[PDB]
Enzyme design. Structure first.
Site, PDB file in Angstrom:
ATOM      1  N   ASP A 167       0.831  -1.195   0.000  1.00  0.00           N
ATOM      2  CA  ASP A 167       0.000   0.000   0.000  1.00  0.00           C
ATOM      3  C   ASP A 167       0.870   1.250   0.000  1.00  0.00           C
ATOM      4  O   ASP A 167       1.821   1.351   0.779  1.00  0.00           O
ATOM      5  CB  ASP A 167      -0.893  -0.022   1.246  1.00  0.00           C
ATOM      6  CG  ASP A 167      -1.958   1.048   1.223  1.00  0.00           C
ATOM      7  OD1 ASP A 167      -2.921   0.886   0.453  1.00  0.00           O
ATOM      8  OD2 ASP A 167      -1.832   2.035   1.981  1.00  0.00           O
ATOM      9  N   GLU A 224       1.979   0.033  -4.816  1.00  0.00           N
ATOM     10  CA  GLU A 224       1.442   1.271  -5.383  1.00  0.00           C
ATOM     11  C   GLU A 224       2.585   2.260  -5.501  1.00  0.00           C
ATOM     12  O   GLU A 224       2.887   3.002  -4.565  1.00  0.00           O
ATOM     13  CB  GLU A 224       0.333   1.837  -4.509  1.00  0.00           C
ATOM     14  CG  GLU A 224      -0.926   1.003  -4.475  1.00  0.00           C
ATOM     15  CD  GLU A 224      -2.030   1.710  -3.718  1.00  0.00           C
ATOM     16  OE1 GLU A 224      -1.805   2.040  -2.544  1.00  0.00           O
ATOM     17  OE2 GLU A 224      -3.105   1.959  -4.301  1.00  0.00           O
TER      18      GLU A 224
END
Ligand SMILES: [Ca+2]
Ligand SMILES: [Cl-]
Length: 644
Positions: free
Chosen positions: A339, A368
């Site tokens: 994340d 990400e």
């Protein structure tokens, strides 16, 4: 907030640049090590003047012992309790400056309900039978994975799921579960798809404000992106959040079962922020160290979640790495999805990749890699701009996502599948794995293992819902064909294919764009809808089988892609390409792939490579004639081959 009396630490403030190098603990034993003869505690807290181990007999009881710890090396405190502490709970109580705080062990590996006390436990009592014999499904290359992104509660909480332990880890261990009209559901549905990896949304312990583990008899739902205890499972996914061993055994049973059924497991991990920078154990125990600060000594908030973890400071880099290795060694995890990876520094990410490689190179690392502002310097962020410094780490390819289905923020904007103008090159960039293919066809990847292809994930509108927002004059059948085309593009592109759970049955959230705390009526896997879409499920299954049958779709290196991938002559709203000369060891001599987003009939001249045959999408073929000619009609994908 009291950051401490600096006389304790040689006059150096926790903000000072010289602080990091003074208190780097070199040992692997932070936390508590239990044995019947004794339990050993070690806590890192350089700025504290005092530290206690507080022992409790019940999760909600009062202390039975309050024991001072001894100051030890490199900023740590130690204590040995020479009694059998089995079944006890503990916290650390520290004095930093004039402030007293009581916190869970940051290295907690078991907790009571809602994670407010550390549980002392014999770890090996939580192992399933034969856990040491757990073997992983084979995996050769990251481009050989097909990822299926799933939330534990979504999987089974629909009332017609046919699953006994609805909402729980154990619910995904149940074979033979059946839904409406008798369809397979749950684990059997997933293994029937042929995906290779299940990526689970946060299964570490997230905050009580997200889901209250003592209120599971009333409605509850959260994605869980609010971390509280990084090294222990989330309690609401266990049959009993009050029994510290239950959530651990039940998660291991889940991973054990998935491995036995041919599936690997990827953990979504959130080391970029904590649920509350003020309340977290980090700030209570060593305020000012584990989180990032702006110039005025307030939190840096590049996460838009209130705080950022200071991954770049050595003790926090150590913390993150030892956390990841705990999940590998104790839970046999097969991969990590980071994340907001662009909030983590490059050195930390590369050390993670190295330590995982030393254990098992087939363990996946994706994340990400967004470009995002933070006090972390730009040249140190683990993002797409800096991907040449992050070998072997995959990044979600947002450029491909947007080219295929249209703009993620302007809801009515069409893309390639819905008939927008000029999206062919963006699709082509993704087909090539996001590498520097040539000319205008270049993205951030050096190697295709760095590019994760997707048209749906837990974030933003589902693919079906984005289509519904952007095709006002389209029929339902026309929208289904566009949806199928997007899935086929993901599964025939170079790189790592990634599917959102339910994408196979055109999953909808009723237009909800950010469903992180929406009720189960929004977030469940709708097995009723699945039963109405068994043709679309079979279609997704056949695309996955097609990719498995053809190594040419899964080239391991950019050099192979540049040598064997060629784009072919094609009109607007279509993309056509070949993979030539047994690319990647393919059994067929050549493949030809057509992405047709034009609803009408059209005719193409095929490259003069030999006697083409149908391999996929034959339902779209009006003619195939050996120049060689292909006629098709309808939005969809066609694949041809020249046999060996
Ligand atoms: Ca929790
Ligand atoms: Cl039906």
């Amino acid at each position: 907030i009291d950051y401490g009396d600096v006389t304790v630490t040689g006059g150096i403030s926790v903000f000072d640049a010289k602080f990091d190098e003074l208190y780097v603990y070199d040992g692997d034993d932070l936390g508590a090590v239990y044995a019947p003869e004794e339990t050993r505690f070690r806590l890192w807290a350089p700025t504290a003047s005092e530290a206690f181990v507080v022992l409790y007999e019940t999760e909600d009881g009062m202390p039975v012992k309050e024991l001072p710890m001894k100051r030890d090396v490199q900023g740590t405190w130690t204590l040995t309790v020479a009694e059998d502490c089995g079944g006890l709970f503990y916290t650390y109580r520290v004095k930093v400056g004039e402030q007293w705080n009581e916190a869970v062990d940051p290295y907690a590996k078991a907790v009571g309900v809602n994670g407010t006390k550390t549980a002392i436990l014999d770890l090996r009592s939580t192992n399933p039978e034969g856990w040491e014999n757990d073997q992983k499904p084979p995996l050769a290359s990251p481009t050989d994975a097909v990822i299926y992104e799933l939330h534990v509660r979504d999987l089974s909480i629909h009332p017609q799921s046919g699953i006994r332990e609805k909402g729980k880890f154990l619910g995904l261990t149940e074979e033979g579960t059946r839904g409406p009209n008798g369809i397979p559901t749950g684990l059997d549905h997933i293994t029937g798809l042929g995906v290779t990896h299940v990526q689970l949304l946060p299964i570490y312990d997230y905050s009580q404000e997200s889901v209250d583990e003592s209120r599971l008899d009333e409605p509850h739902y959260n994605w869980g992106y609010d971390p509280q205890n990084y090294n222990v499972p989330e309690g609401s996914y266990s049959t009993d959040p009050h029994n510290p061993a239950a959530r651990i055994l039940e998660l291991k049973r889940l991973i054990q079962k998935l491995h036995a059924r041919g599936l690997r497991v990827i953990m979504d991990v959130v080391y970029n922020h904590v649920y509350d920078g003020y309340l977290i154990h980090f700030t209570k125990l060593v305020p000012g160290y584990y989180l990032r600060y702006k110039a005025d000594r307030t939190f840096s908030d590049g996460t838009f979640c209130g705080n950022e973890c200071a991954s770049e400071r050595p003790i926090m880099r150590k913390y993150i790495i030892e956390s990841i290795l705990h999940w590998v060694r104790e839970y046999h995890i097969d991969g990590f999805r980071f994340d907001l990876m662009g909030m983590i520094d490059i050195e930390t990410m590369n050390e993670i990749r190295r330590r995982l490689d030393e254990i098992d190179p087939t363990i996946l690392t994706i994340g990400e890699g967004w470009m995002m502002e933070t006090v972390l310097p730009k040249e140190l962020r683990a993002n797409q701009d800096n991907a040449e410094k992050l070998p072997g780490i995959g990044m979600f390819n947002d450029g491909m996502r947007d080219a295929v289905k249209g703009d993620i923020f302007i809801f009515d904007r069409k893309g390639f599948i819905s008939g927008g103008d000029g999206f062919e090159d963006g699709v082509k960039r993704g087909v090539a794995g996001g590498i520097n293919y040539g000319g205008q066809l270049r993205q951030f990847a050096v190697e295709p293992v760095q590019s994760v292809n997707y048209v749906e994930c837990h974030d933003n509108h589902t693919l079906w819902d984005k289509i519904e927002l952007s095709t006002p004059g389209a029929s339902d059948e026309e929208r289904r064909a566009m949806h199928r085309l997007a899935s086929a593009i993901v599964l025939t592109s170079q790189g790592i294919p990634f599917l959102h759970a339910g994408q196979e049955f055109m999953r909808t959230k009723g237009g909800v764009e950010n469903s992180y705390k929406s009720p189960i009526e929004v977030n469940w896997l709708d097995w009723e809808r699945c039963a109405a879409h068994q043709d679309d499920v079979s279609y997704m299954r056949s695309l996955i089988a097609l990719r498995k049958a053809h190594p040419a779709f899964r080239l391991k290196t950019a050099d192979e892609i540049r040598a064997h991938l060629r784009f072919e002559a094609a009109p607007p709203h279509t993309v056509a390409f070949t993979l030539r000369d047994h690319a990647g060891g393919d059994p067929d001599r050549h493949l030809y792939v057509l992405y047709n987003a034009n609803p009408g009939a059209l005719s193409l001249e095929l490259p003069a490579l030999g006697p083409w045959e149908v391999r996929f999408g034959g339902e779209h073929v009006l003619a195939l004639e050996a120049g060689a000619r292909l006629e098709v009609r309808g939005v969809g994908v066609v694949v041809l081959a020249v046999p060996r």
